[PDB]
Amino acid sequence: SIKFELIDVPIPQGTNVIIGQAHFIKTVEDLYEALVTSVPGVKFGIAFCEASGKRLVRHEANDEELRNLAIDLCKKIAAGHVFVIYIRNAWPINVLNAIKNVPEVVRIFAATANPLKVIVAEVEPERRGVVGVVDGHSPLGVETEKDREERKKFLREVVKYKL
Amino acid sequence: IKFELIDVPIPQGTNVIIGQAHFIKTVEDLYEALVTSVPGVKFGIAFCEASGKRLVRHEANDEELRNLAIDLCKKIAAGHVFVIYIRNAWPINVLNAIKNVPEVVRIFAATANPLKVIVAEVEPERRGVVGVVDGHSPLGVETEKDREERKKFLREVVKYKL
Amino acid sequence: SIKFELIDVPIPQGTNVIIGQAHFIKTVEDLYEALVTSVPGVKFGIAFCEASGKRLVRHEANDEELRNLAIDLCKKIAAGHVFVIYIRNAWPINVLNAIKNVPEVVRIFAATANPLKVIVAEVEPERRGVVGVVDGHSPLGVETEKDREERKKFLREVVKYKL
Amino acid sequence: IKFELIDVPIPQGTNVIIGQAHFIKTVEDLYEALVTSVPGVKFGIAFCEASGKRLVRHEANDEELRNLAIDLCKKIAAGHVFVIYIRNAWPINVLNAIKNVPEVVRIFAATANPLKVIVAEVEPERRGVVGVVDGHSPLGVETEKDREERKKFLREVVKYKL
Amino acid sequence: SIKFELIDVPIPQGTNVIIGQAHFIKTVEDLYEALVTSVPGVKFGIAFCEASGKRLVRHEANDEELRNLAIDLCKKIAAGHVFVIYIRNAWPINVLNAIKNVPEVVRIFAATANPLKVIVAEVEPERRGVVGVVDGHSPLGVETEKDREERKKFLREVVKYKL
Amino acid sequence: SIKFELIDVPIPQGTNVIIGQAHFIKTVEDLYEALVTSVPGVKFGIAFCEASGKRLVRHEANDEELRNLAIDLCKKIAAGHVFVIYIRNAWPINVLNAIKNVPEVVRIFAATANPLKVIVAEVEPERRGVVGVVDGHSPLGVETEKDREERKKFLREVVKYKL
């Protein structure tokens, strides 16, 4: 019947992973383009699970370490049309909207640098799909006004994403 | 893997939007997306920081909605999930702005119907959203007469179509 | 999430299916427009599961075969606010971004022409939701440099989507 | 080529959005973009059909705004130009929806300031928009004190920023 | 000083022209892709005025008639970074949003099938820019409610873009 | 449109300029965010011409050289609601779509690193508007098949934006 599997996602320090679902072989080239045209010095690895035809994990990358991380995760998840992206020298917010707008892309399961698990369902031999993800940990509590003041300061004084 | 069901409270006049994002800036960006979408919108936004202090981060201009959002985040208890409750605005008035917030990657539901959130717990403190149960299953198929009434509703009551 | 069910998705040759989730009755009309204004001559069927009130499968089409395929799948999935689209004479990449931008639309579970299964969870009578999909098959291997050259040539000489 | 200046009337409480599109469906699509953006928005939309009957096409839920839009279209008298007047909503509440209407290709201005439209007439009945004069030229450069007041305004009066 | 020129734009029956402004040589390939991936049977010609380097009118097309129409208009307008697209078997609404979203594209001066003129300003030798366009003719009057009923019928019964 | 003026745009090597039109004071903060969250390490200066009230050139930056370049151009153009952006360590394609999506932004006149002129119309004292721009130079000829091969190789082997 329907079997559930958990896949642990390795995330080296300094990297972020983006996992999603698309369709059509052109996905690999369009994602490569979305990444390279978003940030000048981005280092990345992108792998896509072709679900028909030769059913090969298609890939592109300008960093071999990241290429292999992406390919390996695709092989472990082993679900049709799932794509994996590992990036360095760029954050997900720098490339996510471009990814969302790639016509082949239909879902983005996660964008994170936290411990992460992917829940996969296998229904028949070699027929798998992503049920969901476990991104990081559960909440320990609710932030206070002082906590709010602190995260506001972080965004304004450290990363300077807000004024 | 354990599966759990979470009932979602939805007071009359409100709509709930549940999704998944990342990064602490999510809460400020969602606040801005809502407030700049509709004059007088009333809302509550809560986001589950999944690392560090792991605190539910929130912004709001309505205390009732703020706490509803915080409560649901605590009940789902899944990292990077965000909850938005809104009044004086409909989801269609703000959804595209939300989709385009760079931190946002998923929107599980936008509704005013009875709603359940299905959560998977794979280990203590490690949970994720598997899906939602938005409303009820179909009772039948629209007839030509039904279609005409649907068209009339959109053109005469809400006037969203011509 | 009590009971899980597997729903097979019929896909006649020459057709593609797009399954997603939205809200509000206007969904059916907005998806109709998104489709007809994307490609001249597109043939399609679109059905949407109204989750409250009359709880009727709402549907628009310009092709009866596709209208019925869309309606039938909504009946089988039987989950509130899920929509189904079947298209001919157009590919998903020709219409997907328009669909993503429809304000009512919040999720797109799949866009494909491959063998497809929808995993549905039933928590109690008449209360169902989509857990995930199984789009195509798992990978048979990893793309080689030779495979890559052939994939590039396909996109440039056959479908001509790249230069 | 003759250049002409068109003064744009802007009643208190209203904002005008002027642009260029094509195809007759422009008017229905703009109507929908506005009405589904903000509950209770009041508006008038006029579009200059540039061929066929060459009639100014309009939609509106407010007669005052409808005629203001029609009048400006007649004064500019340039094919495919559209004019929108809105009340109970600000341009930022509806502009992205407008940008994404497939028929729309240009937006010359969105403002509540004194406004002039510069039109070029190259032959009888053949006119086009060359540009706009939105408000007035700068009087100086923002000081650090000025910046602080600007930030305070956005955070305390309109509350669009945190 | 500043000299104004008028350029008449030829538009054969059955075609539509899209004129705009972008930047960077990649514009020609990105526009080609936006067009071919939007509509299956689209026929088109796209030309772009490279404003530096070799300053060549760059082009792509799957129809020689349309290719030459695009190139010729670029040569007549002769303004840096202006692009011209001529399409058949597709309407501008089928491809405009994809064009707007191409990162290199910053302006779209016109999308039409009407008599059209482009106003160009020359400020120095070989330094030209687009001032504006004259799209079709001025209004003859204001539509009546009956006229409205008629255009509503056209969209619902003829082109079927509305319900 | 009484008087036309030509404004030269200084562009230091390594910088790109983006000139456009918006409305509302929040423009300055939204453009600041669009830039800083698009590329890590981007250096920029952004100035906006408030057209009413205090009528002050509003401006944000993380680089003084670029802040002053942006402020100076706004002073020269001197037209209500026009904004100017100068960037280093990032190319326009890395930030343009974010800018297009800022709700206050309604026009982008140019994005370039080429010799550039802004044509401004003054209808009366203190009332000015942008008529157009002269981005780079006119075409020297039409791309040959050989030129095309070289352009393709450039995009694939040098900047690597295509495969």
Rounded Cα distance, C29 and D63, in Å: 27
CA distance F56 to D140: 5
Residue D17 CA from chain centroid, whole number: 1
How many whole angstroms separate alpha carbon E50 and alpha carbon F139? 7
What is the resolution of the experimental data for this entry, in Å? Answer: 1.5
- Confirm or reject contact between E156 and chain C (CB < 8 A): no
Give yes or no for D123 touching B (CB within 8 A).
Answer: no
Distance CA C162, CA C151 (A): 11
CB contact under 8 A, E29 and F137: no
DSSP class per residue in F119-133: EEEEEETTEEEEEEE
Q: How far is the C-alpha of A87 from the C-alpha of D97, rounded, in Å?
A: 32
Which chain F residues are closer than 8 Å to B36 by Cβ? Answer: 103
Q: Which of F141, B33, B135 is nearest to D160 (CA)?
A: B33
CB D132 within 8 A of CB D13: no
Q: Which residues pair with F71 in a beta bridge?
A: none
A56 interface with C at CB cutoff 8 Å: yes
- What would the two tokens of residue C146 be? 């030779």
Residue listed under structure tokens 């004194």? D114
For residue B137, list chain C residues with Cβ-Cβ distance below 8 A. Answer: 49, 55, 78-80, 126-128
Q: Is B29 helix (H, G, I), strand (E, B) or coil?
A: helix
* Residue of D29, D59, D54 whose CA lies nearest to D44: D59
Q: Token pair of C28, please?
A: 């059916």
Backbone phi and psi for residue F81, each to the nearest 5 degrees, phi listed first = 65, 20
Burial D104-134 (b: 16+ CB within 10 A, else e): bbbbbbbbbbbbbbbbbbeeeebbbbbbbbb
**Distance between CA atoms of residues B153 and B137, nearest Å:** 22
Which of F2, F55, F71 is opposite residue D136, by nearest beta carbon? Answer: F55
PDB experimental method: X-ray
The dihedral built from the CA positions of residue C117, C123, C125 and C129, taken in this order, carries a sign that is negative
Report d(CA E127, CA C16) in Å as an integer.
49
Subunits with 3+ C-beta pairs closer than 8 A to B: A, C, D, E, F
Interface test with B, best of C4, C5, C49, C56 (most B CBs within 10 A): C56
Q: Do D159 and B38 touch (CB under 8 A)?
A: no
Task: Taking the CA atoms of B142, B147, B148 and B151 in sequence, report the sign of the dihedral they define.
Answer: positive
Q: Which region holds residue D53: left if phi is over 0, alpha if psi is between -120 and 50, else beta?
A: alpha
Angstrom distance (rounded) from CA B147 to CA C60: 9
- Boundaries of domain holding A99: 1-163
Contacts of F162 in chain C (CB under 8 A): 162-163
**What's the number of domains chain F is made of?**
1
| Closest alpha carbon within chain B to F101 | B100
Distance CA C141, CA D154 (A): 55
Per CB-CB distance under 8 Å, the chain A contacts of D151 are: 163
The Cα C110–Cα C98 span in angstroms is 15
* Contacting residues of C for A132, CB less than 8 Å apart: 131-132
Q: Specify whether the CB–CB gap between B97 and D41 falls below 8 A.
A: no
Contacts of B13 (CB under 8 A, 6+ apart): B87
For residues D28 and A88, give the distance between their C-alpha atoms in angstroms, rounded to a whole number: 46
Amino acid making up residue F137 = H
Using CA coordinates, name the residue in chain E closest to B148. Answer: E163
Tokens of B42: 């009333």
**B32–D92: do the CB atoms touch at under 8 Å?**
no
The phi-psi region of residue B161 (left if phi > 0; otherwise alpha if psi is between -120 and 50; otherwise beta) is: beta
Counting beta carbons within 10 angstroms of the beta carbon of residue E149, is it exposed (0 to 12), middle (13 to 18) or buried (19 or more)? exposed
Q: Give the Cα separation of D2 and F5 in Å (integer).
A: 17
Q: How far apart are CA D61 and CA F114, in angstroms?
A: 47
- Contact (CB, 8 A) for E58 and E41: no
For residue F44, the number of C-alpha atoms closer than 13 Å in the C-beta half-sphere is 29
What are the backbone angles phi and psi of residue B57, rounded to the nearest 5°?
A: -100, 135
* C69: DSSP letter: H
**Adjacent-strand bridge partners of D97:** none
Q: Three-state DSSP class for B96?
A: helix
Q: Which residues of E20-32 are buried (b: 16+ CB within 10 A; e: fewer)?
A: bbbbbbbbbbbbb
Phi, psi of F139 (to 5 degrees): -65, 145
| Contact A97/E at CB under 8 A | no
Q: Are D120 and D128 in contact (CB under 8 A)?
A: yes
- The structure tokens listed for D151 are 């930030």
**Closest CB to D38 among B32, B38, B59:** B38
Min Cα distance D89 → chain E (Å) is 25
* Strands in D1-160 per DSSP E: 2-8, 15-20, 42-48, 55-60, 81-87, 106-111, 115-123, 126-134, 140-141
Strand C82-88 and strand C16-21: pairing? antiparallel
Cβ distance A35 to A44 under 8 Å?
Answer: yes
Query: Is residue C138 classed as helix, strand or coil in its secondary structure?
Result: coil
Alpha-carbon gap, residue C137 to C139, rounded angstroms: 7
Q: Which of E38, E34, E57, E36 is nearest to E47 (CA)?
A: E57
Identify any residues that bridge with E92 across adjacent strands, giving them in sequence order: none
On the CB side of C47, CA atoms within 13 Å amount to 30
Contact F107, D108 (CB under 8 A): yes
The residue of chain A nearest to residue B101, with distances taken between CA atoms, is A97
Residue labelled with tokens 């994403």? A161
Structure-derived torsion over alpha carbons of residues A136, A142, A148, A154, reported in degrees to the nearest 10: -20
CA dist., res. C23 & res. C80, Å (int): 9
**In contact, E102 and E95? CB cutoff 8 Å:** no
Task: Decide: residue C6, CB within 10 A, 0-12 exposed, 13-18 middle, 19+ buried.
Answer: middle
Task: Please answer whether residues F47 and F78 qualify as being in contact, where contact means their C-beta atoms are separated by less than 8 angstroms.
Answer: no
Do A127 and C138 make contact, defined as CB atoms within 8 angstroms?
A: yes
Q: For residue D157, give the 3-state DSSP assignment.
A: helix
Whether residues D39 and B37 touch (CB distance < 8 A) is answered with no
CB-CB contact of E131 with E120 (8 Å): yes
Q: Which residue of C has its CA nearest to B15?
A: C23
Chain F partners within 8 Å of C147 (Cβ): none
Kind of pairing, strands A141-142 and B55-60?
parallel
Residue pairs between chains B and E whose CB atoms are closer than 8 Å: 5
> Choosing among C3, C19, C24, C25, which should be mutated to test the B contact, i.e. which has the most B CBs within 10 A?
C24
With beta carbons under 8 A apart, name residues in chain C contacting E41.
40-41
User: What are the backbone angles phi and psi of residue A25, rounded to the nearest 5°?
Assistant: -55, -30
Instruction: Give the C-alpha separation, C84 to C73, whole Å.
Output: 7
Q: How many CA atoms lie within 13 A of C85 on its CB side?
A: 32
Q: Where are the alpha helices (DSSP H) in chain A?
A: 27-36, 64-77, 92-100, 145-153
Q: In terms of CA atoms, which chain A residue is nearest residue E37?
A: A103
CATH of the domain at C63: 3.40.1520.10
- Which 3 state secondary structure label does DSSP give C51? coil
What distance in Å separates residue C46's CA from the closest CA in chain E? 14
Contact D18, D72 (CB under 8 A): yes
Residue F138 near residue E126 (C-beta atoms within 8 A) = yes
F6 touches chain C (CB under 8 A): no
Q: How far apart are CA C31 and CA C18, in angstroms?
A: 11
Is A90 in contact with F33 (Cβ distance < 8 A)?
A: no
C-alpha to C-alpha distance for E132 and F129, rounded to whole angstroms? 14
Q: Which residues pair with E120 in a beta bridge?
A: E5, E130
* CA–CA separation, E143 and E138 (whole Å): 14
In what helix (H) or strand (E) does residue B141 lie, and over which residues does it extend? strand B140-141
- Touching check for A141 and chain B: CB below 8 Å? yes
Q: Is D161 on the interface with A (CB under 8 A)?
A: yes
Look up residue F21 and give its amino acid.
Q
Question: Which residue of chain C comes nearest to D36, CA vs CA?
Answer: C103
Sequence-distant (≥ 6) Cβ neighbours of residue C61 within 8 angstroms:
C44, C45, C46, C67, C70
CA distance linking residue F22 with residue F48, whole number of Å: 8
Chain E residue numbers with beta carbons less than 8 Å from the beta carbon of A101 are 101
Nearest by Cα to B42 from B75, B26, B65: B65
Helix intervals (H) in C78-155: 92-100, 145-153
Residue F26 corresponds to which tokens in the numbers above?
A: 């929040």
What is the distance between the alpha carbons of residues E160 and F1, in angstroms, rounded to a whole number? Answer: 43
Residue A57: what are its φ and ψ, rounded to 5°?
-80, 110
Residues of B in Cβ contact (< 8 Å) with E152: 162
Nearest to D36 among C37, C101, C103 (CB): C103
Within its chain, how far is the Cα of E32 from the centroid? 13
Burial label for A2, CB within 10 Å (0-12, 13-18, 19+), is: middle
Contacts of E20 (CB under 8 A, 6+ apart): E82, E83, E99, E105, E106, E107, E108, E109
* Cα angle, residue A112 at apex, residues A105 and A142 outer, rounded to 5°: 125
Burial E55-94 (b: 16+ CB within 10 A, else e): bbbbbbbbbeebbbbbbbbbbbbbbbbbbbbbbbbbbbbb
**Rounded-to-integer distance, Cα B113 and Cα E51, Å:** 56
Contact C71/C59 with Cβ under 8 angstroms?
yes
- Nearest 5°: the CA angle F55, F59, F62 is 175
3-state DSSP assignment of residue F23: coil
Would you mind telling me the total number of residues written for chain D in this entry? 162
Nearest CA in chain D to C103: D36
Contact D21, D100 (CB under 8 A): no
Q: Show residues of chain E in contact with B161, CB under 8 Å.
A: 162-163
- Residue C43, CB-side half-sphere exposure with 13 Å CA sphere: 11
The length of chain E is 163
Q: Report how far residue A138's alpha carbon sits from residue B49's, in angstroms, rounded to the nearest whole number.
A: 8
- Give CA–CA dist F66/F15, Å, rounded: 9
Question: Tokens standing for A54?
Answer: 């030769």
Instruction: Calculate helix-pair angle for D91-99, B91-99, nearest 10 degrees.
Output: 70
User: Rounded to a whole number, what is the distance in Å from the CA of E82 to chain B's nearest CA?
Assistant: 29
| Residues contacting E23, CB < 8 A, separation 6+ | E51, E81, E104, E106, F92, F110, F111, F112, F135
- H helix runs in A64-157, sequence order: 64-77, 92-100, 145-153
Is the Cα dihedral A92, A94, A95, A96 positive or negative? positive
What DSSP state is assigned to residue A14?
T
CA distances from D112 to A122, D8, D139 (A): 59, 10, 19
Q: Which tokens in the block code for residue B117?
A: 């959130």
- The shortest CB-CB distance from C40 to any of E33, E89, E162 is to E89
Q: What is the length of chain A?
A: 163
F7 interfacial to chain E (CB closer than 8 Å) = no
Contact in structure between B108 and B20 (CB atoms under 8 Å): yes
List chains touching D (3+ CB pairs under 8 A): A, B, C, E, F
Q: Which residue has the tokens 């059209």?
A: E116
Q: Which two tokens stand for residue D125?
A: 């009945």
Contact partners for chain F, using 3 or more CB pairs closer than 8 A, are A, B, C, D, E
Residues A80 and A97: their CA atoms lie apart, in Å, by: 23
Task: Give the gap in angstroms from C-alpha E12 to the nearest C-alpha of chain F.
Answer: 22
Instruction: Report the chain E residue with the minimal C-alpha distance to residue C38.
Output: E94
In order of B140, C74, D36, F78, F98, the CA distances from C59 in angstroms are 12, 10, 21, 55, 36
State the best of B22, B35, B36 to mutate against chain F, taking most chain F CBs within 10 Å.
B36
Size of interface A-C (CB pairs under 8 A): 129
Report residue D59 as tokens.
Answer: 């939609």
How near does any CA of chain E get to the CA of A40, in Å? 14
